[PDB]
Every structure is written in C-alpha cells, then in structure tokens.
C-alpha cells in the first residue's frame with residue numbers, strides 16, 4: 001500500500017494509489033466519487049473530480065464513512081491525501 | 087508564509103520556507119533546532135538536522151511548544167511539514 005499510518009489512525013496516502021488497491025486495503029466495494037464515469041483509476045483522480053481541477057491544500061470532503069483532505073499539491077498534482085476512517 | 091491553516095489550527099508548511107520567514111510568521115524569538123549553528127536556512131533543513139538525511143512520512147518531534155511532522159517527501163526532499171502549536 002502506497003500509504004502510511006499516523007499516530008491518530010489516519011493515513012497519508014499518495015494520490016497515485018489505485019482505487020482497486022485502495023478498496024482492497026480498506027475492505028470496500030463501493031466505487032469512489034467519479035469512478036462510475038469510467039475515466040478515473042487513482043485517488044488523485046477522485047480528488048480532482050470531487051474538488052475541481054486545481055484543488056487547494058486543506059480542501060476536504062466526506063465519503064462513505066471516510067474523510068479525504070488535500071495535504072500536498074505539487075503544481076497541479078494532488079500529491080498526498082490525508083485519509084481517515086470514522 | 088508558504089503555509090495554510092487546517093481546521094484544527096495546525097499548519098501545512100512547505101519544506102522550502104526560510105527560517106527567517108517562519109520565525110517572522112509565528113513571531114518566534116528562539117532559533118529552531120540546529121539553526122544557531124548557522125548551517126540551516128529552511129524548515130526542511132531542520133527536519134533533516136533533527137530527523138536525519140532521509141526521514142520518513144510521520145517522523146515527528148516537538149520543540150518549544152510546537153510539533154513538526156513530515157507529511158510528504160518527494161524522493162529525498164522533505165516537501166511538506168505539519169506544524170502545530172500546543173498549549
């Protein structure tokens with residue numbers, strides 16, 4: 001898994017992580033936002049679908065009992081996401 | 087500041103921020119770890135002084151009422167730091 005667990009249980013996840021692997025890790029079945037459109041295969045792809053083409057650091061949403069927050073951009077790349085299961 | 091504040095009051099700060107600007111921004115009078123020695127000029131350099139040449143995501147330390155946690159590396163570069171003030 002292209003992700004590392006923090007002291008509070010949350011994960012710093014690279015945006016290049018595939019959704020198949022993301023769902024396998026967290027034991028999910030549900031497609032992430034935008035995945036049904038057929039164009040999206042990575043966590044960063046979902047971030048841009050949900051938050052727009054150039055999101056900002058701290059931009060955040062909830063999905064299926066998880067929160068996702070942009071914690072690092074590299075120019076237009078959504079490079080690192082903070083993921084947290086409630 | 088090349089830094090943005092999160093909802094809980096912590097800050098996401100680029101490793102490239104100069105220590106001058108960091109201290110100006112947080113109005114700090116004390117030099118950060120390793121700064122006094124004169125070899126350190128950026129927040130990333132403090133991370134490396136404190137944590138070693140290749141720290142890992144989540145490596146953390148505390149100093150003078152702040153915590154600093156590595157939240158992104160880009161290969162060998164400390165690219166983003168979570169900075170938080172503690173009561």
Ligand SMILES: [Ca+2]
Nearest residue numbers: 072073074165
């Ligand atoms: Ca960056």
Ligand SMILES: [Ca+2]
Nearest residue numbers: 074079160165
């Ligand atoms: Ca980065």
Ligand SMILES: [Ca+2]
Nearest residue numbers: 079158159160
């Ligand atoms: Ca990175």
